[PDB]
């Protein structure tokens, strides 16, 4: 019976590939061939945030493009004032091995997790004047990879075990579980409408989930190695991924295909972070090489390079207004970059 | 300061107090030594941490930590639990530990090659190149019984054992048969050959022959960490 099921799966995959090929009438690079080049993107380190003792794994921006949060393996969360380089908060964690950060869109809560299979939520605005842990979510059986807030009472997590979960913070229970991948889910991106989200796992595939229905909609399977980063196009109709192989790729929700690859012969390292510009024409990716490359989304070209850090770049984010880019790295320093 | 409002000055003062607390945390972070304990299900590292506990919890607990002191030096050992088989992703979090403690059950030859492949992967990893390995070849009494019985043979799984002869320069334990010494030296030589095949300059392996009754493993870890720190100091102080 197994052989018949495998044959049926092969036939279904073949017909899906045929359907995808039928829609590939033209390439993205062909259409954007006559478009004007972006030019050269020069950026300078406006601020450098110091104070972490160990390497930084994650950072997140506040909805007001002024406040940050960052995690290090010292077991510490620091909230920064990016304008004045002031440390607003410093939160000690129970477990040193923290892998991810999240900032609530309202700004009242911050979450984190790591090798301990728990997501801990902290109340930033209490009447006692201190930051205290509000809830511990303890359902995953593997290390916690990514966290993303939906509201003050909803959060989506991806974990080392193949599942992803949606939680109710007040009750502390898994409202939904997403069980499609066959490897460690490494990244997670929320859609602008927050009705869908995408994930990239340690297989070469990415999946589009429905938050309310709690089921997978599409699979994209374009890379060659483990996917480490994922991000949404600002339109919400496309997304980009970074993988252990040197390439970065742009995928399309509506056409169910892959649009363009961002690779060069001199790059033989893996991409750790991926982010888009506010207009969507610039793609920023961090690398195992200690630099960060700016890419032209419409035409696969390297517009500029961010060459400040002297260790592996681990995290990367762009503010909601598109004013600045923050880059974290394994040398325990954060840098804010801006144009001219 | 100039062009700062009173609230701005108070915020700067709060940030400075936070930095002071961060420095106080940094001193303690620098004091202690962090170790990562690895092994298989038959290695017996549970007994090793049990005997480290002499020196002084959710069901899905991702990491177990034990602490102990040798000569007023604090050690933090981290044991991985409730994790999946794939280690390629969560092993990168331990790229700054002082040393890796690898525990091997040398009694059974069926899974010795699996341990050798694990050692190869740990030694040759890109992010674990700097880390030194303290190798414990556990269960010496069981191996001695297995080699005295004569029922099981090492040449079945390692054909080069017949061509191996124990070195003329050796330090066998008193009352130990030559066959036990030959088996132990061959088993250790496999791991030592793997270690010295590449990357000998950056990091060093420290092989030991331990057992369940042995109570000197803490001192061995202390001495090996002392040597690791000595080598790091030689590198840092422009001596080399």
């Amino acid at each position, epitope marked *: 019976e197994l052989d018949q099921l495998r044959q049926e799966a092969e036939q279904l995959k073949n017909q899906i590939r045929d359907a995808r090929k039928a829609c590939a009438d033209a390439t993205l690079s062909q259409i954007t061939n006559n478009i004007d080049p972006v030019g050269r993107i020069q950026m300078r380190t406006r601020r450098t945030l110091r104070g972490h003792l160990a390497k930084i794994y994650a950072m997140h921006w506040g909805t007001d493009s002024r406040l940050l949060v960052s995690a290090s393996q010292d077991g510490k969360l620091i909230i920064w004032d990016s304008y004045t380089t002031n440390k607003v*908060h410093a939160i000690p964690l129970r477990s040193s091995w923290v892998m991810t950060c999240a900032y609530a869109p309202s700004g009242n809560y911050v979450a984190c997790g790591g090798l301990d299979n728990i997501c801990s939520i902290y109340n930033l605005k209490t009447r006692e004047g201190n930051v205290r842990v509000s809830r511990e979510l303890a359902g995953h059986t593997g290390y916690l990879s990514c966290c993303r807030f939906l509201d003050d009472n909803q959060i989506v997590t991806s974990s080392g075990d193949t599942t992803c979960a949606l939680w109710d913070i007040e009750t502390g229970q898994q409202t939904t579980t997403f069980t499609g991948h066959t490897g460690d889910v490494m990244s997670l991106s929320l859609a602008p409408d927050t009705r869908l989200f995408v994930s990239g796992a340690c297989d070469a595939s990415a999946k589009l989930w429905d938050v309310r229905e709690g089921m997978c909609r599409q699979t994209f399977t374009g890379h060659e190695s483990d996917i480490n980063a994922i991000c949404f196009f600002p339109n919400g109709n496309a997304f980009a991924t970074g993988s252990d192989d040197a390439t970065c790729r742009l995928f399309d929700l509506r056409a169910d295909q892959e649009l363009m690859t961002y690779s060069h012969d001199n790059i033989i390292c893996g991409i750790t972070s991926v982010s888009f510009s506010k207009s969507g024409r610039l793609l920023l990716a961090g690398y195992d090489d200690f630099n960060c490359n700016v890419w032209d989304a419409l035409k696969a070209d390297r517009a500029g390079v961010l060459a400040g850090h002297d260790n592996r770049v681990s995290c990367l984010g762009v503010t909601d207004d598109g004013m600045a880019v923050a880059t974290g790295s394994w040398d325990s320093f954060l840098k804010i970059w801006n144009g001219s | 300061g100039c062009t700062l*409002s009173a609230e701005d000055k108070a915020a700067v*003062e709060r940030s400075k107090m936070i930095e002071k607390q961060l420095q106080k945390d940094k001193q303690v972070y620098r004091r202690t030594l962090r170790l990562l304990l690895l092994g298989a299900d038959n290695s017996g590292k549970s007994t090793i941490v049990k005997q480290m506990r002499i020196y002084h919890r959710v069901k899905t607990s991702g990491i177990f930590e034990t602490k102990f002191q040798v000569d007023k030096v604090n050690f933090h050992m981290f044991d991985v639990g409730a994790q999946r088989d794939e280690r390629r992703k969560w092993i990168q979090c331990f790229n700054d530990v002082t040393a890796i403690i690898f525990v091997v059950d040398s009694s059974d030859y069926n899974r010795l090659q699996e341990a050798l492949n694990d050692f190869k992967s740990i030694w040759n990893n890109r992010w674990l190149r700097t880390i030194s390995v303290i190798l414990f070849l556990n269960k010496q009494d069981l191996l001695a019984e297995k080699v005295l019985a004569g029922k099981s043979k090492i040449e079945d799984y390692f054909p080069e054992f017949a061509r191996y002869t124990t070195p003329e320069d050796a330090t066998p334990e008193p009352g130990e048969d030559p066959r036990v010494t030959r088996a132990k030296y061959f088993i250790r030589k496999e791991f030592v050959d793997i270690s010295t095949a590449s990357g000998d300059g950056r990091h060093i392996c420290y092989p030991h022959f331990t057992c369940s009754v042995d109570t000197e493993n803490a001192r061995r870890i202390f001495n090996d960490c002392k040597d690791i720190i000595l080598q790091m100091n030689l590198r840092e102080y422009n001596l080399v």
Partner: single-chain antibody
Amino acid sequence: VQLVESGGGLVQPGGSRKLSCSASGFAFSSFGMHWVRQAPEKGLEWVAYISSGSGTIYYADTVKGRFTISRDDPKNTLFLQMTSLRSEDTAMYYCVRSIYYYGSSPFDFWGQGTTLTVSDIVMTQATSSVPVTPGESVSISCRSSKSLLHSNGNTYLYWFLQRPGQSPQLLIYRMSNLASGVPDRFSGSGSGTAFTLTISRLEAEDVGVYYCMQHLEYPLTFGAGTKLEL
């Protein structure tokens, strides 16, 4: 959160007194503390300030050489040692919390106050008494001698309400932000020099005296107080 003041009473016009402020329910060591006094049938008047760490200390010009402020963080107690007490030192002294970071709400909790009896930007509140009835809209205005707007963009204007027989309660901080626990009917606005406070629907709970304070520079100065009465 609770602040309880101790000390105060009949003191000679040459004696010395020590006031204590016992704090519980919050992280005392991470808050700056102020002393504010209100003379009998008069308005508020800032006295002293000690920061979260004891590095920064400020005093009003009238009490600079005689008063001293100190805190005992393990005991969660705030002190005020007073010497050479004069007849104009007769007032009710309050204990006020203040925490400063990006987006905080200083001057949020006041103590119950202790009474003592001894045997600069100018803030103008033109109105003194106003007759109101429940279910109406009223506006309370104030003016500043110096422009309160800063290069940061903040204005640093605060509004307080002191109900009959109670301690002041913060309403609006930095001229527009509404304090937690305050109803949405209160609104704050104004220019860089002239400001106004609006109440949409009056209640019997809103009757009291309203003060305006500036936090642009030290010393901190208050207004005369606009009294809403039925």
